[PDB]
mmCIF file with all atom_site columns, C-alpha atoms in Angstrom:
data_model
loop_
_atom_site.group_PDB
_atom_site.id
_atom_site.type_symbol
_atom_site.label_atom_id
_atom_site.label_alt_id
_atom_site.label_comp_id
_atom_site.label_asym_id
_atom_site.label_entity_id
_atom_site.label_seq_id
_atom_site.pdbx_PDB_ins_code
_atom_site.Cartn_x
_atom_site.Cartn_y
_atom_site.Cartn_z
_atom_site.occupancy
_atom_site.B_iso_or_equiv
_atom_site.pdbx_formal_charge
_atom_site.auth_seq_id
_atom_site.auth_comp_id
_atom_site.auth_asym_id
_atom_site.auth_atom_id
_atom_site.pdbx_PDB_model_num
ATOM 1   C CA . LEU A 1 1  ? -15.123 -19.499 -10.819 1.00 51.29 ? 1  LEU A CA 1
ATOM 2   C CA . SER A 1 2  ? -15.413 -17.603 -7.479  1.00 54.61 ? 2  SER A CA 1
ATOM 3   C CA . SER A 1 3  ? -15.247 -20.982 -5.739  1.00 54.85 ? 3  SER A CA 1
ATOM 4   C CA . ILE A 1 4  ? -11.544 -21.160 -6.563  1.00 57.09 ? 4  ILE A CA 1
ATOM 5   C CA . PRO A 1 5  ? -9.694  -19.753 -3.449  1.00 55.79 ? 5  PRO A CA 1
ATOM 6   C CA . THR A 1 6  ? -7.631  -16.633 -3.999  1.00 59.27 ? 6  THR A CA 1
ATOM 7   C CA . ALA A 1 7  ? -3.847  -16.469 -3.275  1.00 59.35 ? 7  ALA A CA 1
ATOM 8   C CA . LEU A 1 8  ? -4.666  -14.336 -0.207  1.00 63.09 ? 8  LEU A CA 1
ATOM 9   C CA . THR A 1 9  ? -6.867  -17.175 1.139   1.00 62.92 ? 9  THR A CA 1
ATOM 10  C CA . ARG A 1 10 ? -4.182  -19.729 0.496   1.00 61.58 ? 10 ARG A CA 1
ATOM 11  C CA . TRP A 1 11 ? -1.609  -17.588 2.183   1.00 61.22 ? 11 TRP A CA 1
ATOM 12  C CA . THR A 1 12 ? -4.021  -17.200 5.029   1.00 60.62 ? 12 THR A CA 1
ATOM 13  C CA . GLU A 1 13 ? -4.187  -20.976 5.432   1.00 61.45 ? 13 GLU A CA 1
ATOM 14  C CA . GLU A 1 14 ? -0.366  -21.185 5.251   1.00 59.38 ? 14 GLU A CA 1
ATOM 15  C CA . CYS A 1 15 ? 0.063   -18.430 7.811   1.00 59.21 ? 15 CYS A CA 1
ATOM 16  C CA . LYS A 1 16 ? -2.369  -20.080 10.188  1.00 60.26 ? 16 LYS A CA 1
ATOM 17  C CA . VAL A 1 17 ? -0.564  -23.390 10.005  1.00 59.00 ? 17 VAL A CA 1
ATOM 18  C CA . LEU A 1 18 ? 2.977   -22.000 10.103  1.00 57.78 ? 18 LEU A CA 1
ATOM 19  C CA . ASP A 1 19 ? 2.501   -18.988 12.398  1.00 58.64 ? 19 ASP A CA 1
ATOM 20  C CA . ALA A 1 20 ? -0.761  -18.189 14.131  1.00 55.47 ? 20 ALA A CA 1
ATOM 21  C CA . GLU A 1 21 ? 0.464   -15.422 16.536  1.00 57.84 ? 21 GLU A CA 1
ATOM 22  C CA . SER A 1 22 ? 3.749   -14.374 14.919  1.00 60.90 ? 22 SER A CA 1
ATOM 23  C CA . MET A 1 23 ? 1.856   -12.961 11.898  1.00 63.51 ? 23 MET A CA 1
ATOM 24  C CA . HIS A 1 24 ? 0.670   -10.019 13.999  1.00 63.41 ? 24 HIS A CA 1
ATOM 25  C CA . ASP A 1 25 ? 4.275   -9.374  15.079  1.00 59.90 ? 25 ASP A CA 1
ATOM 26  C CA . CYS A 1 26 ? 5.494   -9.369  11.416  1.00 57.38 ? 26 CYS A CA 1
ATOM 27  C CA . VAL A 1 27 ? 2.605   -7.033  10.485  1.00 54.04 ? 27 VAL A CA 1
ATOM 28  C CA . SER A 1 28 ? 3.946   -4.728  13.158  1.00 56.07 ? 28 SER A CA 1
ATOM 29  C CA . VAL A 1 29 ? 7.571   -4.948  12.084  1.00 55.22 ? 29 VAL A CA 1
ATOM 30  C CA . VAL A 1 30 ? 6.644   -4.310  8.483   1.00 50.97 ? 30 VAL A CA 1
ATOM 31  C CA . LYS A 1 31 ? 4.194   -1.565  9.363   1.00 51.74 ? 31 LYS A CA 1
ATOM 32  C CA . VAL A 1 32 ? 7.026   0.326   11.032  1.00 52.69 ? 32 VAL A CA 1
ATOM 33  C CA . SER A 1 33 ? 8.643   0.522   7.608   1.00 54.87 ? 33 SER A CA 1
ATOM 34  C CA . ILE A 1 34 ? 5.583   1.170   5.519   1.00 55.49 ? 34 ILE A CA 1
ATOM 35  C CA . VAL A 1 35 ? 3.780   3.932   7.545   1.00 55.37 ? 35 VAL A CA 1
ATOM 36  C CA . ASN A 1 36 ? 6.965   5.894   7.936   1.00 53.49 ? 36 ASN A CA 1
ATOM 37  C CA . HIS A 1 37 ? 7.598   5.805   4.114   1.00 52.17 ? 37 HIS A CA 1
ATOM 38  C CA . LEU A 1 38 ? 3.973   6.566   3.214   1.00 49.86 ? 38 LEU A CA 1
ATOM 39  C CA . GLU A 1 39 ? 3.752   9.414   5.763   1.00 47.93 ? 39 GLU A CA 1
ATOM 40  C CA . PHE A 1 40 ? 6.949   10.878  4.296   1.00 48.56 ? 40 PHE A CA 1
ATOM 41  C CA . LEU A 1 41 ? 5.395   10.771  0.860   1.00 45.33 ? 41 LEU A CA 1
ATOM 42  C CA . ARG A 1 42 ? 2.096   12.092  2.192   1.00 48.23 ? 42 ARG A CA 1
ATOM 43  C CA . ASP A 1 43 ? 3.916   15.079  3.764   1.00 50.49 ? 43 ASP A CA 1
ATOM 44  C CA . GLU A 1 44 ? 5.934   15.684  0.547   1.00 49.36 ? 44 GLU A CA 1
ATOM 45  C CA . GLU A 1 45 ? 2.808   15.526  -1.720  1.00 48.44 ? 45 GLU A CA 1
ATOM 46  C CA . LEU A 1 46 ? 1.010   17.739  0.926   1.00 50.00 ? 46 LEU A CA 1
ATOM 47  C CA . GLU A 1 47 ? 3.772   20.303  0.682   1.00 49.37 ? 47 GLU A CA 1
ATOM 48  C CA . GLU A 1 48 ? 3.617   20.051  -3.153  1.00 50.70 ? 48 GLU A CA 1
ATOM 49  C CA . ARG A 1 49 ? -0.144  20.719  -2.915  1.00 50.64 ? 49 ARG A CA 1
ATOM 50  C CA . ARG A 1 50 ? 0.290   23.729  -0.695  1.00 52.50 ? 50 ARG A CA 1
ATOM 51  C CA . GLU A 1 51 ? 3.046   24.988  -3.033  1.00 54.63 ? 51 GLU A CA 1
ATOM 52  C CA . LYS A 1 52 ? 0.841   24.577  -6.064  1.00 54.66 ? 52 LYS A CA 1
ATOM 53  C CA . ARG A 1 53 ? -1.883  26.483  -4.348  1.00 51.61 ? 53 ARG A CA 1
ATOM 54  C CA . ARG A 1 54 ? 0.420   29.254  -3.467  1.00 50.35 ? 54 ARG A CA 1
ATOM 55  C CA . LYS A 1 55 ? 1.709   29.441  -7.014  1.00 51.50 ? 55 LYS A CA 1
ATOM 56  C CA . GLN A 1 56 ? -1.914  29.426  -8.120  1.00 49.80 ? 56 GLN A CA 1
ATOM 57  C CA . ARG B 2 1  ? -0.247  6.006   -0.640  1.00 48.14 ? 1  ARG B CA 1
ATOM 58  C CA . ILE B 2 2  ? -1.987  7.435   2.416   1.00 47.20 ? 2  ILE B CA 1
ATOM 59  C CA . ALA B 2 3  ? -4.829  9.611   1.284   1.00 46.09 ? 3  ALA B CA 1
ATOM 60  C CA . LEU B 2 4  ? -4.884  13.380  1.405   1.00 43.36 ? 4  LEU B CA 1
ATOM 61  C CA . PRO B 2 5  ? -8.148  14.890  2.679   1.00 40.76 ? 5  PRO B CA 1
ATOM 62  C CA . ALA B 2 6  ? -9.513  17.779  0.666   1.00 42.64 ? 6  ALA B CA 1
ATOM 63  C CA . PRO B 2 7  ? -8.328  21.398  1.345   1.00 41.55 ? 7  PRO B CA 1
ATOM 64  C CA . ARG B 2 8  ? -10.597 22.376  4.160   1.00 37.65 ? 8  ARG B CA 1
ATOM 65  C CA . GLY B 2 9  ? -10.365 26.103  3.649   1.00 41.36 ? 9  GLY B CA 1
ATOM 66  C CA . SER B 2 10 ? -8.272  28.129  1.191   1.00 42.33 ? 10 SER B CA 1
ATOM 67  C CA . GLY B 2 11 ? -5.752  30.208  3.065   1.00 40.68 ? 11 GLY B CA 1
ATOM 68  C CA . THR B 2 12 ? -2.361  29.257  4.475   1.00 40.01 ? 12 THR B CA 1
ATOM 69  C CA . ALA B 2 13 ? -2.182  31.219  7.719   1.00 35.79 ? 13 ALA B CA 1
ATOM 70  C CA . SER B 2 14 ? -5.225  29.658  9.382   1.00 38.09 ? 14 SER B CA 1
ATOM 71  C CA . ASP B 2 15 ? -6.716  26.732  7.370   1.00 38.11 ? 15 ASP B CA 1
ATOM 72  C CA . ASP B 2 16 ? -3.473  25.026  6.424   1.00 39.22 ? 16 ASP B CA 1
ATOM 73  C CA . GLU B 2 17 ? -2.214  25.496  9.981   1.00 37.71 ? 17 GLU B CA 1
ATOM 74  C CA . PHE B 2 18 ? -5.239  23.288  11.154  1.00 34.97 ? 18 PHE B CA 1
ATOM 75  C CA . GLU B 2 19 ? -4.861  21.052  8.163   1.00 34.94 ? 19 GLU B CA 1
ATOM 76  C CA . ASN B 2 20 ? -1.406  19.982  9.255   1.00 32.23 ? 20 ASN B CA 1
ATOM 77  C CA . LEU B 2 21 ? -2.828  19.595  12.765  1.00 30.01 ? 21 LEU B CA 1
ATOM 78  C CA . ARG B 2 22 ? -5.546  17.308  11.281  1.00 30.39 ? 22 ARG B CA 1
ATOM 79  C CA . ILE B 2 23 ? -3.617  15.296  8.689   1.00 32.15 ? 23 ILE B CA 1
ATOM 80  C CA . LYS B 2 24 ? -0.385  14.950  10.719  1.00 31.68 ? 24 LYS B CA 1
ATOM 81  C CA . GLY B 2 25 ? -2.080  14.828  14.186  1.00 30.02 ? 25 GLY B CA 1
ATOM 82  C CA . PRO B 2 26 ? -1.097  11.854  16.336  1.00 31.17 ? 26 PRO B CA 1
ATOM 83  C CA . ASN B 2 27 ? -4.731  10.807  16.144  1.00 33.95 ? 27 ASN B CA 1
ATOM 84  C CA . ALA B 2 28 ? -5.886  10.773  12.536  1.00 37.90 ? 28 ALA B CA 1
ATOM 85  C CA . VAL B 2 29 ? -7.644  8.658   9.937   1.00 37.51 ? 29 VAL B CA 1
ATOM 86  C CA . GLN B 2 30 ? -5.067  7.532   7.351   1.00 37.49 ? 30 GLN B CA 1
ATOM 87  C CA . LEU B 2 31 ? -7.173  6.200   4.575   1.00 39.17 ? 31 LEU B CA 1
ATOM 88  C CA . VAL B 2 32 ? -5.327  4.540   1.649   1.00 42.48 ? 32 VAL B CA 1
ATOM 89  C CA . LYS B 2 33 ? -5.352  5.192   -2.067  1.00 41.36 ? 33 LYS B CA 1
ATOM 90  C CA . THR B 2 34 ? -3.599  3.094   -4.732  1.00 41.53 ? 34 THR B CA 1
ATOM 91  C CA . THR B 2 35 ? -0.940  4.386   -7.101  1.00 43.49 ? 35 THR B CA 1
ATOM 92  C CA . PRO B 2 36 ? -1.698  4.366   -10.869 1.00 43.75 ? 36 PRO B CA 1
ATOM 93  C CA . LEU B 2 37 ? -0.892  1.079   -12.434 1.00 45.39 ? 37 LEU B CA 1
ATOM 94  C CA . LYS B 2 38 ? 2.657   0.698   -13.576 1.00 45.70 ? 38 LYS B CA 1
ATOM 95  C CA . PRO B 2 39 ? 2.983   -1.371  -16.796 1.00 47.10 ? 39 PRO B CA 1
ATOM 96  C CA . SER B 2 40 ? 4.360   -4.642  -15.356 1.00 47.49 ? 40 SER B CA 1
ATOM 97  C CA . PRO B 2 41 ? 5.941   -7.048  -17.867 1.00 46.87 ? 41 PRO B CA 1
ATOM 98  C CA . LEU B 2 42 ? 5.333   -10.765 -17.473 1.00 44.92 ? 42 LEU B CA 1
ATOM 99  C CA . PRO B 2 43 ? 7.884   -12.672 -15.419 1.00 45.45 ? 43 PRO B CA 1
ATOM 100 C CA . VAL B 2 44 ? 9.743   -15.391 -17.387 1.00 44.17 ? 44 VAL B CA 1
ATOM 101 C CA . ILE B 2 45 ? 8.990   -18.756 -15.936 1.00 48.87 ? 45 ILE B CA 1
ATOM 102 C CA . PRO B 2 46 ? 12.122  -20.770 -14.989 1.00 48.40 ? 46 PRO B CA 1
ATOM 103 C CA . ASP B 2 47 ? 12.650  -24.057 -16.845 1.00 46.67 ? 47 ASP B CA 1
ATOM 104 C CA . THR B 2 48 ? 12.449  -26.108 -13.632 1.00 48.87 ? 48 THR B CA 1
ATOM 105 C CA . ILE B 2 49 ? 9.125   -24.472 -12.850 1.00 50.19 ? 49 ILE B CA 1
ATOM 106 C CA . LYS B 2 50 ? 8.156   -25.667 -16.321 1.00 48.93 ? 50 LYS B CA 1
ATOM 107 C CA . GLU B 2 51 ? 9.190   -29.251 -15.628 1.00 46.79 ? 51 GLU B CA 1
ATOM 108 C CA . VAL B 2 52 ? 7.003   -28.990 -12.555 1.00 50.48 ? 52 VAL B CA 1
ATOM 109 C CA . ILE B 2 53 ? 3.991   -27.592 -14.384 1.00 50.49 ? 53 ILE B CA 1
ATOM 110 C CA . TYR B 2 54 ? 4.346   -29.983 -17.349 1.00 49.85 ? 54 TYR B CA 1
ATOM 111 C CA . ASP B 2 55 ? 4.568   -33.104 -15.137 1.00 51.12 ? 55 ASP B CA 1
ATOM 112 C CA . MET B 2 56 ? 1.008   -32.421 -13.885 1.00 51.62 ? 56 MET B CA 1
ATOM 113 C CA . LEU B 2 57 ? -0.317  -31.898 -17.437 1.00 54.16 ? 57 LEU B CA 1
ATOM 114 C CA . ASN B 2 58 ? 1.199   -35.333 -18.304 1.00 54.49 ? 58 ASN B CA 1
ATOM 115 C CA . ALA B 2 59 ? -0.568  -36.761 -15.259 1.00 54.82 ? 59 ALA B CA 1
ATOM 116 C CA . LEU B 2 60 ? -3.862  -35.683 -16.930 1.00 56.75 ? 60 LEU B CA 1
ATOM 117 C CA . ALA B 2 61 ? -3.061  -38.339 -19.536 1.00 57.85 ? 61 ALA B CA 1
#
């Protein structure tokens, strides 16, 4: 049933109790690693798309 | 994966020049798309985790 709380809601409770304000800081530290990787893959895929267009 | 917006205009000299300006611009709208599902196998439950789960089921009775 939808009444049962999802893992993300339980983790939300845990986070609140164990770190109210340090969660944002951890989001920022992990973001620095995720956005750089995803932007690298976005630019590589975008180059691939331009290349495939040129070959087309 | 951060999304790729559609090719604005065919043509590399002009349209793709402003498509790198747009997609890679300092100020942009990085929407997200998911990767296609990779066929994850089920993780084997450790035996101690099964002596934790089984002790609750015995507490039913």
